[PDB]
């Protein structure tokens, strides 16, 4: 039973109605940066005792923190910005949340309703700008609609395939006095009538049947399984099917497990891509068959019966055409299939030990490998040490690039929502603000931003946020002085011709530039640099043991390449397994 | 006669066709940040000997630098980004350039044409996203269209009312070999047939007539006059009409001039707003009657005959309905009116000394004023000292907020394009990257970013750009530890209730946070802090005399208020002339 | 009701549009491709494994043929009034099921679908998804131009026929042998049927005749045809219908046959919108 701060017959500002609408959704944290068009909302936030605001230093930091909050908790992330330049600073995070299916509610202040369309001060038609990069958006045109629209926004953001919803609120609506009606029904008849139903036994029986008739089955799990950790684990016990995971699915099935093929795709392991290449049954659970994973679509799982379980009917058959399809929640499909598998256990007699042994041969012939040069620090090794010293229990956020791939390859995530990374859009600058949101959502967890030097500097201003909010955010900065992933493609395909990928100072070519330690010092954050591989273990331990925030500048040789690599649009026969920039 | 690097019958990549298309437009500087979808463009840039790339550390820094380049030179600014997260990082600058009518050409890499619409890796429908925040945009669907589309983009960006044009280039088009045709005609028949014609003598005679019949004429000049400095000056000689300027028009008529009423509007001088309030003839040259200037439209110049000269027919009568209107280039209208005024000089006998004397009485009763408290540094005083020590010849860029207003009020810009400030959108974080672009465009000029602590930290990452490019950018950081302009509105209208406007560390409340000197140190930029008003003059002099970049952290009491202030939607009778946060 | 449609069936959906597969009903097996090629491939497999598969559904076919004899398509003959269903059966007989048939939209459209045995595709030209009245006459024009040696008959309703009646001039000028079988019930019949079933027969602007001369056929469609030099006739007695249709077919060039029908006819059977098979209506009319 909710307790309002206003009498049921007492008129309050629309901004107070909006804040209470957030309170009634269970919101405890927002990421709000004030401006003229949203001042009323910020005043109403100070009047709330249950909602805390984390003031970022850039609205892109605000939306990315809301993402990290959401990705690490399963709850919707809430960011708030003013009109115009505040709203446009949210755009990268909105697109990021849509491509990765992250539940997000973004609220933007807007000019007064009568000023809309007149090129008013700090006016941006943000509803038009963001229509194609949000799951849905709204322009509130009356204070009476605030309870309903906020409720619909949270429902749309969190139900079905999750995504971002933007709510544009004109300033005059924030000031207008009204008595809210919290009993209004939502106006989503089409959306609600097309929400997937529980999976029928008809479809679930056929899948278990295809499993018993197959000899080379491969699980292909992705971001849709983040809430099915227990069900997927039980499913693997009952079937013994090896698990290949996408970038977004990492941790749904434990990485340090015997049946784990780890990541597949462009930078997936040789044995995971091998398994899919030669499988006869592909169980595609919570995946969208993106080009990083499949390469050439015609060659992807070319001799496999493809079972695709997805909550979005539009994804089924979008790129790869399945044989069997189930449109529904993969959590429920796993539960139904687990019952059938448990009952018919002695009848089915499932044993894929011959297939698993064929894969474990590839696993030992072509494992993930890295080279140690003198006393230089291998980035892959630094992440393995972090995994060891944190016991694989840390929440990991990343930027985008080589360090992102190494953070995916060389850390054994035991649970979903430890892995917070921008996969579909791949937005640099995500790692630091995402760690802010993850730490606020999980204040007792070890939170480490494994960042690159290009990605880290893009939103370096959020170090001030970390200090002011006294968040124990650790930064493991893999510093190669380059835009590494673009540098790698220069080496492979452009004869190592450098086109603006060096991030240091060419006048002092052998100096680490910039000095990231002084960025941390500017914000009162203790920091250190490590260069010798012998010193790396104690340096990471110091970062972990030092209470509060900490930045560890880990210098790495830039000639490292992420391996293996299947070229874009290629097949398994095109996989690159050796070579670097030396 | 242009000299290509390829034979007229030699096929080259579309990326090379695009770079040569830029060369044929006279482009010498681009602001390009590489990514997968634009690697080909970056490779082709290294093959150009006439185009230099300034690598920013954030694409928002790239687009804002392109703006500063354009605003300070009259040439179009060119920024380039990769697909997806690179493109979305341009959005604030695109909207900023549209609202301020800044000529800009933005090029974005895109996924291959066949991948468009499939939720491909790093795909954003940027043409759809930016349609409402650009003057025009394109999606190139064939390599043959590159010469024509690039030519149309530069023509549209720079002709008529200037604005940003975005060109989206799929990666496969960049790789396709072709022989360009540089003789293709542009496909803009509607736009070119509606381009304003030279002003007819019919309309110009009527204006000169209205001038001779008026007794209280006021010039109301804005961003449309940036290329009419000489003509406007000659016009003021022949008429003796006092000049009130918008934020965007500052410097079109010299500020340190006898007839200068300085800025009008919400934070305009009392005498400028007085002149417009009681004028009988309002010469509105290159302005758009925005709400910051007019307040309540019905009360703005309520007893004046309004002459509006604008190159955009859609602006004439959009908010304020004029009596006489001329749709054309104000440069040509001034030239035509100057001829008529010079010929009929002895016949017209123009003398407004009675009106000028009535205004100079208001100018002495209500001048711009600031208060000095002990040894604390008044921000207004710091800008006056900078004006003196630079002899009013510096290019000034700003962030957004109180410091922006003080930079407009207390610096006497002698020429247009010394003032680079985000007026319509009002985007924080503009000042530092805009100074980068202005310095690259004007390498022998004094370039000073008068920034606020909130605005400066948003794009602080561009300090690395400044050092690496060895640009002599000076930063005059007016540090009040607050989001000052929002703080001022909290004081006036919300009983000084703070809603997330303090930017320091509440744990160490009396410590300057963050330490901006260490941000500069991180990027090898010499810096200093000044707190005592007695030390300010030598500190600014040191900043100016020290070669290369320099950051001066100027600590200011946060209780300062920008005055005067006409409340939003108010009239001249509502002007606030006294008070602060004390 | 989608949940009740083929509720106990394994659904195989072959469609050339990937967006249709799983749009409303979720299939078990799906093939995105040309159904022509899928049939060719399946026919090879079926022909090779013929003796191996031993397909026989005679038990299922017999269960259906029991329903086919218990609940066939039925219509009632009242005195000498012309049943519209009967008129279409006679047209089927006299044309040997080889005519190209276009229709308007409404009851006559349903009866043209139910009571004509089309032997080949592209004999049936009818607006199904949008269901646009006025389609029948101009569609017959295009079909006749494309198939100048075929028998082309527009089975039209009086509301639908008058919407694009101006194309009679096109038919004459182009000398197209378009036959019009006008099932004239003086009403917007399909909307009238829903008025009878669900609104207690309360008429809301469905009568197309002249209320001043209520028992007169209005308008006189024969004079529309006469205005464009198209021979025409009206038939009212069921005994005269067979010769009238034969005259329409034998008369070279265009011809309009105004077939007067009792308006109280209902299209049967009828499953109400959003209903299930258990809701099928098998009897009743507007009497
Ligand atoms: C530099 C870089 C390199 C990359 N290389 C790789 C790589 O080598 N390998 C790799 O895997 N990725 C890689 N990616 C990541 C990549 O581009 C995609 O983000 C990722 O492959 C897609 O993850 P997914 O297939 O699990 O789909 P997601 O983006 O996670 O979407 C989830 C899918 O499941 C469905 N779903 C959601 N909820 C449910 C539910 N409750 N029940 C059923 N279904 C549900 C959704 O409708 C959607 O179809 C890379 C990214 C970057 C930036
Ligand atoms: C915090 C803040 C406070 C502000 N307060 C004030 C204030 O007190 N006072 C103030 O003036 N501004 C203020 N502004 C700035 C403001 O919001 C607008 O940007 C500014 O007032 C509009 O300038 P303008 O009228 O010259 O039109 P512009 O934006 O400069 O547009 C130019 C106009 O001239 C026309 N034009 C362009 N070229 C030509 C040509 N060759 N010939 C003829 N016409 C041409 C264009 O079509 C357009 O109509 C403030 C901004 C901020 C961020
Ligand atoms: C907002 C944004 N701008 C540009 C991007 C284009 N990309 C990349 C890519 C793979 O998406 O190529 O398409 S990765 C990358 C360089 C990463 O520099 P680092 O942080 O130092 O990490 P590392 O360990 O050295 O590799 C760029 C420039 C991007 N994704 N986001
Ligand atoms: C991207 C962005 N986000 C938020 C903004 C909303 N605003 C402002 C305003 C007037 O536009 O209010 O609408 S000004 C301002 C605070 C300026 O902090 P400072 O840089 O330290 O300068 P100062 O000398 O102290 O005043 C905010 C938060 C904005 N315009 N841009
Ligand atoms: C352009 C147009 N306007 C109105 C229509 C709405 N409908 C119908 C329906 C089923 O689509 O109802 O939705 S059918 C119909 C009446 C048909 O009159 P008839 O031609 O005489 O044939 P009959 O043998 O008597 O039934 C109407 C008014 C329509 N479809 N098209
Ligand atoms: C420097 O000007 C300033 N500063 C601050 C800190 N706040 C405000 N607020 C304000 O102008 N409110 S408004 O009357 O409704 C309004 C009217 C017209 C157009 C826009 C608009 O607001 C939306 C954007 Cl501010 N203005
Ligand atoms: C880590 O992956 C990576 N890294 C780097 C540095 N570059 C590339 N390039 C690349 O994938 N080119 S592409 O085949 O045409 C292509 C195909 C499909 C979708 C997009 C797409 O490109 C556009 C965005 Cl990269 N990929
Ligand atoms: Mg080792
Ligand atoms: Mg790097
Ligand atoms: Mg003084
Ligand atoms: Mg400030
Ligand atoms: Mg009979
Ligand atoms: Mg009818």
DSSP A39-80: HHHHHHHHT-SS-EE---SSHHHHHHHHHHHHHTTSSPEEEE
Rounded distance between C-alpha atoms, residue B219 and residue B234, angstroms = 13
Separation between Cα atoms, residue B247 and residue B419, nearest integer Å? 9
Annotate A388-431 with DSSP letters as a single string.
HHHTT--EEEE-SSHHHHHHHHS----STTSEE---SS--TT-H
Spatial CA neighbour of A458 closest among B516, B35, B460, B517: B460
Pairwise CA distance, residues C78 & C83, whole Å = 8
Alpha-helical regions (H) of A171-253: 171-175, 189-193, 201-213, 229-239
Q: How does DSSP classify residue B145?
A: G
Backbone dihedral region for residue C192 (phi beyond 0: left; psi -120 to 50: alpha; all else: beta):
alpha
A-chain residues near B423 (CB < 8 A):
none
For chains A and C, tell me whether 3 or more CB atom pairs sit within 8 A of each other: yes
Q: Which partners does chain A have (≥3 C-beta pairs < 8 Å)?
A: B, C
Q: Which residues of C touch A (CB under 8 A)?
A: 3, 8, 10, 18-19, 21-23, 26-32
Q: Which residues contact B75 (CB under 8 A, 6 or more apart)?
A: B26, B69, B103, B441
**Pair B281, B304: CB distance under 8 Å:** yes
Report CA(B75)–ligand 13 centroid distance (Å).
70
Among all bound ligands, the one having the nearest atom to the CA of C156 is 5
Class of the A196-368+563-582 domain?
alpha beta
Q: Ligand 7: distance of its center to the CA of A562 in Å?
A: 15
Q: Is B287 marked as a binding-site residue?
A: yes
Cis before B440 (ω within 30): no
Pairwise CA distance, residues B332 & B198, whole Å:
7
Domain A1-195 identical in fold to domain A369-562: yes
Choosing from B23, B40, B59, B315, which is the catalytic residue? Answer: B59
Among the partner residues A95, A428, A470, nearest to B124 by beta-carbon distance: A95
Label each residue of C130-167 as H, E or C: CCCCCCHHHHHHHHHHHCCCCCEEEEEEHHHHHHCCCH
Cα of A494 from ligand 7 centre, angstroms: 14
Q: Residues B215, B275: contact at Cβ < 8 Å?
A: no
Backbone CA torsion sign across A544, A546, A548, A554:
negative
Return phi, psi of residue B310, to 5°.
Answer: -145, 140
Buried b (16+ CB within 10 A) or exposed e, B378-405: bbbbbbbbbbebbebebbbbbbbbbbbb
Instruction: Out of B96, B504, B524, name the one closest to residue A505 (CB).
Output: B524
What's the Cα-to-Cα distance from A382 to each of A412, A419, A420, A525, B554, rounded to whole Å?
A: 13, 17, 18, 21, 41
Q: Which residue has the tokens 């208060």?
A: B371
Question: What is d(CA A521, CA A467) in angstroms, rounded to the nearest whole number?
Answer: 11
Give the HSE-up count for residue A265: Cα atoms under 13 Å, Cβ half-sphere.
26
A487 near A581, Cβ under 8 Å? yes
What is the token pair recorded at C117?
Answer: 């045995």
Give B492's DSSP letter: H
Residue A460, classed as helix, strand or coil, is: coil
Inter-helix orientation angle A330-343/A201-213, to 10°: 60
Which of helix, strand or coil describes residue A449? strand
Say which residues have a Cβ less than 8 Å from residue C173's Cβ, sequence separation at least 6: none
A522/B524 touch (CB, cutoff 8 Å), yes or no: no
> Looking at ligand 4, which atom is closest to the CA of residue B482?
25
Q: Do C21 and A317 touch (CB under 8 A)?
A: yes
Terminal CA-CA length for chain A: 65
Residue B168's SS3 state is strand
Resolution (A): 2.4
Which residue puts its alpha carbon closest to atom 9 of ligand 5? C106
Cβ(B551)–Cβ(B520) under 8 Å?
yes
CB contact under 8 A, A88 and B92: yes
DSSP B36: G
- Tell me, yes or no, if B59 is annotated catalytic: yes
Structure tokens that stand for A206 in this block: 């056929």
The secondary structure of residue B47, as a DSSP letter, is: T
Task: Output the DSSP codes for A230-253.
Answer: HHHHHHHHHH---EEE-TTTTTSS
> Tell me, which fold does domain C74-267 have in CATH?
Rossmann fold (3.40.50)
Contact A85 B92 (CB under 8 A): yes
Is-cis flag, bond preceding A6, omega within 30?
no
**Angle, to 10 degrees, between the axis of helix C107-114 and the axis of helix C189-198?**
100
- Cβ distance of C21 and A316 shorter than 8 Å: yes
Q: Taking CB atoms and an 8 Å limit, are A323 and C29 in contact across chains?
A: yes
Mutate to test the pocket of ligand 7, among A296, A564, A568, A569 (most ligand atoms within 8 A of CB): A568
Q: Tell the residue number behind the tokens 């004439």, with chain if given.
A: B316
Q: What residues have a C-beta under 5 A from ligand 11, the ion? A: B 452-454, 480, 482, 484
The reply to whether omega before A51 is within 30° of 0 (cis) is no
Q: Measure the CA–CA gap between B419 and B401, rounded to whole angstroms.
A: 15
Which of C254, C228, C234 has its CA nearest to residue C141? C254
Contact A325 C10 (CB under 8 A): no
Structure tokens at A525: 């954050």
C-alpha A404/C-alpha A486 separation (Å) is 13
Instruction: Find how far residue A392's CA is from the centre of its chain.
Output: 18
User: How far is B515 from A131, CA to CA, in rounded Å?
Assistant: 40
Q: What is the dihedral of CA B145, B151, B153, B158, to 10 degrees?
A: -170
* Closest listed ligand to the CA of C76: 12
Which of A196, A321, A326 to mutate: most C Cβ within 10 Å? A321
Q: How far apart, in whole angstroms, are the C-alpha atoms of residue B413 and residue B417?
A: 9
Integer Cα distance of A361 and A356 in angstroms: 9
Active site residue: A122, A175, A184, A559, which one?
A122
Q: Report, at the CATH architecture level, how domain A369-562 is classified.
A: 3-Layer(aba) Sandwich (3.40)
Catalytic residue chosen out of the listed positions A40, A152, A171, A543: A171
- The shortest C-alpha distance from C43 to chain A (Å) reads 19
Q: What angle do CA A75, A81, A87 make, to 5 degrees?
A: 110
| Cβ B399 vs Cβ B372: under 8 Å | no
Q: Could you say which of C3, C22, C23 has the minimum Cβ distance to residue A325?
A: C22
Active site residue B488: no
- DSSP letter string over A82-109? -TTHHHHTTHHHHHHHHHHT--EEEEEE
Token pair for residue A340?
A: 């059938």
- Ion ligand 8, residues whose Cβ is below 5 A away: A 372, 381
Residue pair B81/B454 in contact by the 8 Å Cβ criterion: no
Pocket of ligand 6 (CB under 6 A): A 36-37, 83, 111-112, 115, 120-122, 171; B 266, 291, 485-486, 489, 568-569
* Closest in A428, A457, A518 to B85, CB measured: A428
Nearest-atom index, ligand 5, CA of C84: 24
Domain spans of chain B, in order of start: 1-195, 196-368+563-582, 369-562
Could you give the C-alpha distances from A474 to A520, B30, B286, in angstroms and in order? 11, 36, 53
Strand residue runs (E) in B162-249: 164-170, 177-178, 217-221, 243-245
Residue B248 among known ligand-binding residues: no
Find out whether A110 and A169 touch, Cβ atoms under 8 Å. Answer: yes
What residues of C are in contact with residue A317 (Cβ under 8 Å)? 18, 21-22, 30, 32
Which residues in chain B precede a discontinuity of more than 2.5 Å between C and N? none
CB contact under 8 A, C26 and A326: yes
Distance CA B220, CA B284 (A): 5
CATH superfamily of B1-195: Thiamin diphosphate (ThDP)-binding fold, Pyr/PP domains (3.40.50.970)
């Amino acid at each position: 039973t909710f307790i309002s701060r206003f009498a049921p017959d007492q008129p309050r500002k629309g901004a107070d109605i909006l804040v209470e609408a957030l309170e009634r959704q269970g919101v405890e944290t927002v990421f709000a940066y004030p401006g003229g068009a949203s001042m009323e909302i910020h005043q109403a936030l100070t009047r709330s005792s249950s909602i805390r605001n984390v003031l970022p230093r850039h609205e892109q930091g605000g939306v990315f923190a809301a993402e990290g909050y959401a990705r690490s908790s399963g709850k919707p992330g809430i960011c708030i910005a003013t009109s115009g330049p505040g709203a446009t600073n949210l755009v990268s995070g909105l697109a990021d949340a849509l491509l990765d299916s992250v539940p997000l509610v973004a609220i933007t202040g807007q000019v007064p309703r009568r000023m809309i369309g007149t090129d008013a001060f700090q006016e941006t038609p943000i509803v038009e700008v963001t229509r194609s990069i949000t799951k849905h958006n709204y322009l509130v045109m009356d204070v009476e609609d605030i309870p309903r629209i906020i409720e619909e926004a949270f429902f749309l953001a969190t139900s079905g395939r999750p995504g971002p919803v933007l709510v544009d609120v004109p300033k005059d609506i924030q000031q207008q006095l009204a008595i809210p009606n919290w009993e209004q029904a939502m106006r989503l008849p089409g959306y609600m009538s097309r929400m997937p139903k529980p999976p029928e036994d008809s479809h679930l029986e056929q899948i278990v049947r295809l499993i018993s008739e197959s000899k080379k089955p491969v699980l292909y799990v992705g971001g849709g399984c983040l809430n099915s950790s227990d069900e997927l684990g039980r499913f693997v016990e009952l079937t013994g099917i090896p698990v290949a995971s996408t970038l977004m699915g990492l941790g749904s099935y434990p990485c340090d497990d015997e049946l784990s093929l780890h990541m597949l795709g462009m930078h997936g392991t040789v044995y995971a891509n091998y398994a899919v290449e030669h499988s006869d049954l592909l169980l595609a659970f919570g995946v969208r068959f993106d080009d990083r994973v499949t390469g050439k679509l015609e060659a992807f799982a070319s001799r496999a019966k493809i079972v695709h379980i997805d909550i979005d009917s539009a994804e089924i058959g979008k790129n790869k055409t399945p044989h069997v399809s189930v449109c529904g929640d993969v959590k429920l499909a796993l539960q139904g299939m687990n019952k059938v598998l448990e009952n018919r256990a002695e009848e089915l007699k499932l044993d894929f030990g011959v297939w698993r042994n064929e894969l474990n041969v590839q696993k030992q012939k072509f494992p993930l490998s890295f080279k140690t040069f003198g006393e230089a620090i291998p980035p892959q090794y630094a992440i393995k040490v972090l995994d060891e010293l944190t016991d694989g229990k840390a929440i990991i956020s990343t930027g985008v690039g080589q360090h992102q791939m190494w953070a995916a390859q060389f850390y054994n995530y035991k649970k979903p929502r430890q892995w917070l990374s921008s996969g579909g859009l791949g937005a640099m600058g995500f790692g630091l603000p995402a760690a802010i949101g993850a730490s606020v959502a999980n204040p007792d967890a070890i939170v480490v931003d494994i960042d690159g030097d290009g990605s880290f500097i893009m939103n370096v201003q959020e170090l001030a946020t970390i200090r002011v909010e006294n968040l124990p955010v650790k930064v493991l900065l893999l510093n190669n002085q380059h835009l590494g992933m673009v540098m790698q493609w220069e080496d492979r395909f452009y004869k190592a011709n450098r086109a603006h990928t060096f991030l240091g100072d060419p006048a002092q070519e052998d100096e680490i530039f910039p000095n990231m330690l002084l960025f941390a010092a500017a914000c009162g954050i203790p920091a250190a640099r490590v260069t010798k591989k012998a010193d790396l273990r104690e340096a990471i331990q110091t970062m972990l043991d030092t209470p509060g925030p900490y930045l560890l500048d880990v210098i790495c040789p830039h000639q490292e390449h992420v391996l293996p690599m299947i070229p874009s649009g290629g097949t398994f026969n095109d996989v690159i397994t050796e070579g670097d920039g030396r």
